[PDB]
Amino acid sequence: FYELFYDDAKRASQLLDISPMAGIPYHAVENYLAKLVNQGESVAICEVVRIVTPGTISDEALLQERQDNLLAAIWQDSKGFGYATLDISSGRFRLSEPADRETMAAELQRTNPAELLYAEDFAEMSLIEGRRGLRRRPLWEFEIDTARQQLNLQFGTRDLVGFGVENAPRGLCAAGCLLQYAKDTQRTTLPHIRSITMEREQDSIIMDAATRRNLEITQNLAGGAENTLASVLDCTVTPMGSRMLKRWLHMPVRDTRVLLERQQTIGALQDFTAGLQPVLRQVGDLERILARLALRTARPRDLARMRHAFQQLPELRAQLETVDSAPVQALREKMGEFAELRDLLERAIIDTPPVLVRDGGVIASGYNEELDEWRALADGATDYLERLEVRERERTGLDTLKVGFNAVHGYYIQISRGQSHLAPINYMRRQTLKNAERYIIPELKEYEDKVLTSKGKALALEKQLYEELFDLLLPHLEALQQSASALAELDVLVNLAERAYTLNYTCPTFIDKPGIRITEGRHPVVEQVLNEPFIANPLNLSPQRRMLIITGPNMGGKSTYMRQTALIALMAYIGSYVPAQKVEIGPIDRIFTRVGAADDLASGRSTFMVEMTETANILHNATEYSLVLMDEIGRGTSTYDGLSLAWACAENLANKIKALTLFATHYFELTQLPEKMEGVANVHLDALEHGDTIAFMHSVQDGAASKSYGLAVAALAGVPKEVIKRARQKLRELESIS
Amino acid sequence: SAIENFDAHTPMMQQYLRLKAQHPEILLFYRMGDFYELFYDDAKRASQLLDISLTKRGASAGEPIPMAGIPYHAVENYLAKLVNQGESVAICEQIGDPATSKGPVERKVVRIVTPGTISDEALLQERQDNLLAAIWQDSKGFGYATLDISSGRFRLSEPADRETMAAELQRTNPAELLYAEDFAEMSLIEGRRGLRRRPLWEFEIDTARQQLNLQFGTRDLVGFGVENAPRGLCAAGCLLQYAKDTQRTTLPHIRSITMEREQDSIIMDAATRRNLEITQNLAGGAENTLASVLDCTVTPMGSRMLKRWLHMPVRDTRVLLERQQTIGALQDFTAGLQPVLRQVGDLERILARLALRTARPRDLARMRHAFQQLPELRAQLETVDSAPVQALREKMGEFAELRDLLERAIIDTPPVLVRDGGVIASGYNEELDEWRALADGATDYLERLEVRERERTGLDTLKVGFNAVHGYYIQISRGQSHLAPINYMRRQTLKNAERYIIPELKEYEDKVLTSKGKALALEKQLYEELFDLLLPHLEALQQSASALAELDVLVNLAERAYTLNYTCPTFIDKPGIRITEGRHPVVEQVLNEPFIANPLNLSPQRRMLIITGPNMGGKSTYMRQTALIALMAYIGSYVPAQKVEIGPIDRIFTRVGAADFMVEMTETANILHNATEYSLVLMDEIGRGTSTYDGLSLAWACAENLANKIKALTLFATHYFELTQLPEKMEGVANVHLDALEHGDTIAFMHSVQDGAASKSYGLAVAALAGVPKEVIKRARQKLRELESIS
DNA sequence: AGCTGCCAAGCACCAG
DNA sequence: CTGGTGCATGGCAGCT
Ligand SMILES: Nc1ncnc2c1ncn2[C@@H]1O[C@H](COP(=O)(O)OP(=O)(O)O)[C@@H](O)[C@H]1O
Ligand SMILES: [Cl-]
Ligand SMILES: [Cl-]
Ligand SMILES: [Cl-]
């Protein structure tokens, strides 16, 4: 009668579509929780037993197979932002101290919690207000002292200088709240969470949210991983590899040595792609199975598949023996064999065990001698009762007699009605049905004790011998994790080498001065979805050629050449081969892309006001080591104010900063900077006006544009001949003051 | 792979396949026993759509048949899932009595559930219409028809071209759309939910004419006005054929067809309807729309009427004026009426289920309850001195006699279904009471028997009980079962009990049961006889429910007009809009900060207004509130202003920015082609260019065409100052702007419309504000100056 | 104050 | 031939 989640669940049924009285049936509860937790709801239920949150789940039902699922904690100190991100499924722990708001944007974009944690002291709500899975936390939780002790307790030693996170408090606070929230939901220790690291910005190539979205790295603009760079590159054969590949794409790195290693790896492995993958496909999501082992929730089929992986190691060892590559061999060693455990599990568990342990049938016969005997006793008792059925049927002549069973009455003999009158004298009746009568006899109950007590003693030992396995395997968890790390990395590398082969990517060769030198380069995502031949394009950007002014019609052609550039760098500085014939590329410290739509529109500020704020970010932070992409800025204001701003912008980018820029514009006036400035040149996109359409060429020729194709499109859109004729007049007369 | 000849299938499957063959594409619920079965693909597909298990049904030879199914009583929930996923289901039943059947009992498909023909409450949304529509492209134009099966509203139009057809579908939003196989222009239709590809022969004109006429019961269709709409009549032909084939009873509530023709309403293209946020916001939701502000109606059938009215503003003066002098007249009575109207409820659809002979007892319950409010409203509306309100009151009626019948026939507050008894109240039928006497007189007698026997035996635990299988029994705990009389014939056994029968008990079981069942079948006759009595007054009852709906809307609008402070607009001869203190009807309510009122003055002399200012400055709101004030005026409503004076309007255009290109250029082309001097046109960006003065040259030429030739009333907002040069060159084009001021370090917006073009575009000030380095802002200021030296 | 498995009813199966 | 059984999902009696 009283209360419940009914009122707050009519809320979430309103937003999953199942209906103050809405609900879910029992048989699909795990699938329905799978989508509330999906969109971030801290559930725990009863028509309390179990507790589940969106940031702390390990059940492979409730997690999306191919993507990370992080729990994170944020707070805005008087000085700066403190932030931490845990992967409850791998024990991958991150900690960070963003300085400015723009850094705290770029993290939240890259990382993307399914369950955020935040404090009252936090006043910059515009950063996280419209976020999935928001939870609110007190003062005490963000603590610095209990944190250290609780952290150092979790990990190992009496200090965190080994992890390198010691003299950075704002991050330790986040971490402190996070771990203590995560152990709470679990109500069990977390041995897999054995370390923690802090990314140092200065290492990775820095990409802000707007840049990270506009490139569509893991996520397209609409919301999916459809039609995105991941989609085209992720041909990995294990889920843990898929995850790793994505984390890699968002974290391109500047240590050109760490890259060169990955390039020589992709090289050596390029031939073994054929039969290195069908083996690796069978390693499965070991990284997550191992997490269910740490949390002691790993089901029979988790251990069965863990074993199946162990079978693939000597084969992978044997294949990677051939590979003449120092770093590939490091990964061969790190993959390990664990042959003793392979044997333990083969002996300890049958072919294909059931979904759950609850009802026995998991531990294979031979492993433990006690358990075998009990089964034979229980098969022993099962035997006589089958005999008894036959014994009794032919003895009485009643062909419809049956020995049956349920928890209500235990074992029972069942004659049908009509034949029921011929029931033996000693047959104690017990239960009449529409067309049957059920009896018991002294012997039956005697053997019923036999079957049940036998089963019960074997079934309760299965669970001991099972829980034992964990105490036998968990000591190695250390190495086991580094195996599934090494494996997931093979998946990724062996993929990045196959992709390079069957998409004809070249190997970029880095230079020490800033500059890009693409030769027949393409947008890695478009050249696949497009079913017409992709027109490749060149690019040269020495510091003698610092900025290209791109004029002529946009229509996607411009904002591709630009976007394909940023991706050929991204892909370079991630070690992967790149979609081109040759690519020499210099160091890049930051990638900026102010390209495409958007527009807010939630904050009442407009497109333009957005574009400028994005352009403000660029000008303030862009170094001579940065790539800068600027789709036709200056639209949506008076022709003069926008030309002045595009001029003023190009001026400061072409001189004060010097950054490697592609500057798209419609303004013809801007095509005079090659005459007024050092190191700035003109390129344009053509169109051909064939038949009854205009073909928007995507080929980048040199020089400014000598034609504007606006009126031309108007004619094709149905705009009356008379008006375009009158437009043409006014164009001519506006252009011949300029 | 097996050859399956007809004669090889088991007798059951033969009856299935000739039935499924009649419905090859849609799912088929095959009533078999207490379940509705599905088979083969129907079973696999149905298993996935419903989360029900797939299974086998055994065969002698050959592979077993796939099967899924659900119990006949759980049927609705599952129909609900399927209909809300756009699937149709054919509901097939058992006709004959299987006891008198040696072979398979006769089985017929009795109705078909489809997303466009649903009429039961549990499957429809209350505050929203759910229409079925048919679409047909001729050698010359289009034919489109709509039906509201749960109210009978059956309309017909013949859209001129691709773009109007686009308007209509956007507006009506049918939940199921019947198109001919040879439909030429498919980008109009594909994607849409509940599509239904119909064979060309279903759009035959003669069949349509003859079949519409049979249904309406007239010789020709001249009184309806649709005798000269061939194309329309066709789509209506197919829309009707479908309706009958889905329902499979007669449809007496579908009694009339009227025709929509564009001249009778302000036409509004897809973009316009979506941009004005009339019933759906810019981001899909129903929140912060014109209707969220206006709909405070108290019944669902009113909400839906208002929502329709909002989308089809009438141009006929008399209706408008009548509506006005009603809204005014009813200003004070908007507390006396409303809560009494609330209790009338969704009578519209209740009468639909009555038309279909499908109404549940509680539908009658709520129908009675609604009738009881009619003398309480009649006595209220008499007082009001309003010529139309009396006409509506006359229309509303009383149904003194029928309110009576429902008080005598049915109980206080009945169960959900008739199915198993308890609906018809005492004294309505003596024979039902005779059989209920026998029932009650046998039950209490059996309880006397309980006591009678407990003495006769002394056994204290003796009970009398009833179980569905065995029936009436005498229960003795096993602890005393031995002490049971020799009279007692043991019938059922349990673990701690033993149940018996005696020929007295079984004699009175057979009387209580036989008499209970005679009551049931009699209630079921009595209940299905109510329809026979009420149906004769369907027409009168329908137009009453209509009058209650319209009143619900008008009463609401009156209250709205008071609560939110609107004024009555007046209409003029010439085109024009003269607004005094014109505020945005939705944006004024969502704000906390008092909404700045703002005038407007458009006439044939002053027909275009170039709106300068900066973005964020309030430019769009101004344009939008202009169209919204116009639309409300033209549904008869009061207006969010002080004094609004408005000329005849035929269309309202919207070219407000953001594509998804080429789009914006077409929507512009659409305006230039179809705009007359009675239309209102609101534009943000007519289309971008690819060079500096490229696209700007279009805007100029277009403004010129709208001003010189079309002479539409235009509101053109723009940042391009080259266009504030237009009032100098062009006749009847003026300059206005939204005021903003820089107080040094930041910038504020006045939201007030001033004459003359803005002092400057604040492009640079906004960039500065956005964070662009002072450093660079300065540079731009210098480059500006030199541009204005030659300008 | 839950859970378990009989049963609903048509028709086909199939073991005696 | 006769008398048993299978087979969807839901409801309730018969048991803790
Ligand atoms: N008359 C007004 N009074 C008060 N606020 C207004 C008024 N007009 C507009 N606003 C507010 O100004 C904001 C921007 O208005 P909008 O018309 O979108 O500007 P623009 O069209 O120039 O970009 C809106 O969010 C609205 O809340
Ligand atoms: Cl058992
Ligand atoms: Cl009507
Ligand atoms: Cl502006």
Residue A435 beta carbon within 7 A of nucleic strand C:
yes
Q: Which helix (H) or strand (E) holds B245?
A: helix B230-247
DSSP states of B733-750: EEEEEEEEE--TTS-EEE
Q: What are phi and psi of A180, to 5 degrees?
A: -70, -30
Beta strand A197-198 pairing with A92-96: parallel
Say how many Å lie between the CA of residue B306 and the centre of ligand 3.
12
Q: At what angle do helices B347-355 and B538-563 cross, to 10 degrees?
A: 160
User: How many Å lie between the centroid of ligand 2 and the Cα of residue A381?
Assistant: 11
Say how many Å lie between the first and final Cα of chain B, rounded.
84
Does ligand 1 have an atom closer than 6 angstroms to the CB of B640? no
B620 ligand 1 Cβ < 6 A: yes
Distance CA B11, CA B32 (A): 14
A568: left (phi over 0), alpha (psi -120 to 50) or beta: alpha
* Dihedrals phi, psi of A65, to nearest 5 degrees: -45, -50
- Among B533, B496, B545, CA closest to B153: B545
Kindly give, in sequence order, each residue whose CB lies less than 8 Å from that of residue B617, ignoring residues fewer than 6 positions away: B738, B739, B740, B749, B750, B751
Name the binding residues of A: 552-559
CB–CB of A491/A238 below 8 Å? yes
- Rounded CA gap, A236 and A65, in Å? 13
CATH architecture assigned to B566-791? 3-Layer(aba) Sandwich (3.40)
B416: tokens are 């959900």
Query: Is A205 within 8 Å of A258 (Cβ atoms)?
Result: no
Contact at CB, B701 and A726, closer than 8 angstroms: yes
Distance A281 CA to ligand 4 centre (A): 56
Residues 6+ apart with CB under 8 A from B772: A612, A615, A616, A619, A645
User: What kind of fold does domain A1-66 have according to CATH?
Assistant: MutS, DNA mismatch repair protein, domain I (3.40.1170)
List residue ranges whose Cβ is under 7 angstroms from nucleic strand D.
A 25, 400, 402, 408, 416-419, 431, 435-436; B 32-33, 35, 37, 52-53, 55-58, 67-71, 73-74, 77, 467-468, 492, 494-497
Element (H, E) at B213: helix B205-216
3-state secondary structure B139-177: CCCEEEEEECCCCCCEEEECCCCHHHHHHHHHHHCCCEE
d(CA A4, CA A505): 58
Q: Which CATH superfamily is domain B129-264 in?
A: MutS, connector domain (3.30.420.110)
Which residue is nearest nucleotide C13, judged by alpha carbon to C1' distance?
B58
Q: Which CATH superfamily is domain A67-201 in?
A: MutS, connector domain (3.30.420.110)
- Cβ neighbours around B3 below 10 Å, total: 5
Task: Say what the resolution is, in angstroms.
Answer: 3.4
Sequence letter at residue A137: R
- The Cβ of residue A549 has, within 10 Å, a number of other Cβ atoms equal to 26
Compute the distance between CA of residue A308 and CA of residue A40 in angstroms, rounded to an integer: 34
Chain B, 6 to 65: residues with Cβ < 8 Å from chain A are: 51
Report whether A591 contacts A570 (CB < 8 A): yes
Please give the torsion angle defined by the CA atoms of residues B761, B767, B769 and B775, in that order, rounded to the nearest 10 degrees.
Answer: -120
Peptide bond into A601 cis (omega under 30): yes
B620 Cα: distance to centroid of ligand 1 (angstroms): 7
CB A260 within 8 A of CB A326: no
Q: Which residues on adjacent β-strands are paired with residue B29?
A: B91
Domain B1-123, CATH: 3.40.1170.10
Tell me the C-alpha distance between A282 and A265, whole Å: 22
Q: Which residue has the tokens 């059947």?
A: B101
Q: Which residues of A724-738 are buried (b: 16+ CB within 10 A; e: fewer)?
A: bebbbebbeebeeee
Residue closest via CA to ligand 1's atom 5 equals B595
Tell me, what amino acid is at B556? N
| Contact by Cβ (8 Å): B272, B520 | no
The tokens 């693909």 sit on which residue?
B41
B579, B583, B584, B587, best to mutate for ligand 1 pocket (most atoms within 8 Å of CB): B587
Determine contact, residues B740/B614, Cβ cutoff 8 Å. yes
Contact (Cβ atoms closer than 8 angstroms) between residue B359 and residue B121: no
Per the CB < 8 A criterion, the answer to whether B478 and B471 are in contact is no
Question: By three-state DSSP, how is residue A135 classified?
Answer: strand
Q: Which nucleotide is nearest to B52 (CA to C1')?
A: D8
d(CA A415, CA A432): 10
Any A CB within 8 A of B285 CB: no
Give me the residue spans of the domains in chain A: 1-66, 67-201, 202-324+442-504, 325-441, 505-738
Measured distance CA(A685)–CA(A90) in Å, rounded? 48
Residue type, A135: R
Return the CATH architecture of domain A202-324+442-504: Orthogonal Bundle (1.10)
Q: Report d(CA B177, CA B173) in Å as an integer.
A: 9
CATH number given to A505-738? 3.40.50.300
CA distance B632 to B628: 6
Which residues from chain A sit within 8 angstroms of residue B614, using beta carbons? 637
Nearest Cα to Cα of residue B309 among B46, B665, B556, B85: B556
Q: How far is the CA of B32 from the C1' of C11 (A)?
A: 8
- Tell me the backbone φ, ψ of residue A100, rounded to 5 degrees: -105, 170
Using CA atoms, how far apart are residues B41 and B65, in angstroms rounded to an integer? 10
Give the B window 753-782 contacts with A, CB below 8 Å. 761, 763-764, 766-767, 769-773, 775-777, 779-781
The separation, in Å, between residue A425 CA and nucleotide C16 C1' comes to 25
Is A639–B693 a contact, with Cβ atoms under 8 angstroms apart? Answer: yes
Residue pair A573/A253 in contact by the 8 Å Cβ criterion = yes
User: Are both A202-324+442-504 and A325-441 of the same fold?
Assistant: yes
What is the residue-wise DSSP string for B362-416? HHHHHHHHHHTTHHHHHHHHTTS--HHHHHHHHHH---HHHHHHHHHHB-SS--S
Asked if B322 contacts B316 with a C-beta cutoff of 8 angstroms, the reply is no
Three-state secondary-structure class, residue B708 = helix
Would you tell me how many other CB atoms lie within 10 Å of the CB of residue A277?
19
Taking an 8 Å cut-off on Cβ atoms, the answer to whether B702 and A723 are in contact is yes
Per-residue CA distances from B54 to A247, B23, B49, B68, B77 (Å): 41, 21, 11, 5, 19
Contact B471/B509 with Cβ under 8 angstroms?
Answer: yes
The amino acid sitting at B350 is: I
Q: Which CATH architecture has domain B265-383+537-565?
A: Orthogonal Bundle (1.10)
What's the rounded Cα separation, in Å, for the pair B519 and B421?
Answer: 8
CATH number for region B399-534: 1.10.1420.10
> From 1.10.1420.10, 3.40.50.300, 3.20.20.140, 2.60.40.10, which CATH number describes the A325-441 domain?
1.10.1420.10
